[PDB]
Each structure stands twice: as structure tokens, then as C-alpha cells.
Amino acid sequence: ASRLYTLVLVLQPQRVLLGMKKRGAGAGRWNGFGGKVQEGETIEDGARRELQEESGLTVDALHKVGQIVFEFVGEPELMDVHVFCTDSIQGTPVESDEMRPCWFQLDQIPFKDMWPDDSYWFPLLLQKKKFHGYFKFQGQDTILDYTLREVDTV
Ligand SMILES: Nc1nccc(-c2ccccc2)n1
């Protein structure tokens, strides 16, 4: 029914790292770093692995910040996205064929060039709030309906 994904935001006091995907799901959009969780792999281990694969960064300890379930009408599998944040990383962001990373000042987060759901839950992430969300999409751009509530335990 649902498929596990990870999403990692490198969020520091005055800036956040995003990556511009070159192809595939989310191409042409700034997003965090993540992907599918593998068999026998913890969600958190999958989040660390994907951060390195896509951005070249090594994270020390991830913090759970949210869970967002995505529905795309006409697609059978729900996307169960486990969202993490970190402020302590190692390495320098690496641009590859697949991904172009860039730091953004918090007052210049490029929401018009991001998935539209980000405009709803990023304000919570920036104020250190935890959340459970659900977004029903039609295509890649239209949110048909959604729920989003703050939680004390992800
Ligand atoms: N910001 C945002 N919005 C919608 C979907 C996603 C996503 C995250 C991880 C993996 C696949 C999709 N991310």
C-alpha cells in the first residue's frame, strides 16, 4: 500500500542546503536529499546513505522531524516519506550529473521552484516543529487536498 522514502534537510542557523535534481522524479525542482529505503536497512541508515549519494555529505546523527504521506491520483503506491534534519555535516556539497546542490538563506528559500507541499511544512521545519502530513496530488503540481498537524513524537 505504501513505500518508504527518506528526505533530509541540512538546516543550519541561517541557511538550508537544497539540491536541484537533473532527471527523474522531481527534476527541475529544489528539494532535500533522499530516496527509497532498501531491504534490511533502517530508515535512518537509508537517510544517511541517500544524503551522501546525492550531495556528497556525511551526516553525524539525524533528527526525525516529520512524516509525510503522498498520494498521486491514479498511482497505486502511497509515498511514505520520513523527513529528517541535521546541522552537523562533514564534507563539501558535490555537484554531480544527477544533482546540483546550493545553500539558501532562510529568507530566500525558492518555494516557487520547489514541490508545492513544501510551502506548507517548511515553516514548521524552520521553527523546529515536528509534523505529520498527507498531501493528495494530481500530477506534479496540483494539491487536491491535504492535512498537516504538529506532533510531539514523529
Ligand atoms: N518536498 C517533497 N514534496 C513531494 C515529494 C517529495 C519527495 C521526497 C522524497 C522522495 C520522493 C518525493 N518531496
For the chain, how many structural domains are there in total?
1
Please name which of 105, 102, 104, 84 lies closest in space to residue 93, comparing C-alpha atoms: 102
Question: How far is C-alpha 142 from the chain's CA centre?
Answer: 18
Query: 113 is written with which cell numbers?
Result: 521552484
- The whole-angstrom separation of Cα 101 and Cα 51 is 11
| Residue with CA nearest ligand 1 atom 9 | 7
**33: amino acid identity, one letter:** F
- The whole-angstrom separation of Cα 129 and Cα 121 is 9
Contact 23, 98 (CB under 8 A): yes
Experimental technique of record: X-ray
State which residues form the domain around 5: 1-154
Give, rounded to a whole angstrom, the gap between the first and last alpha carbons of the chain. Answer: 20
Mutate to test the pocket of ligand 1, among 5, 71, 111 (most ligand atoms within 8 A of CB): 5
Task: Give the ligand 1 atom nearest the CA of 115.
Answer: 3
Q: What is the CA radius of gyration of the chain?
A: 15
Domain CATH number, residue 74: 3.90.79.10
Query: 18 is written with which cell numbers?
Result: 537544497
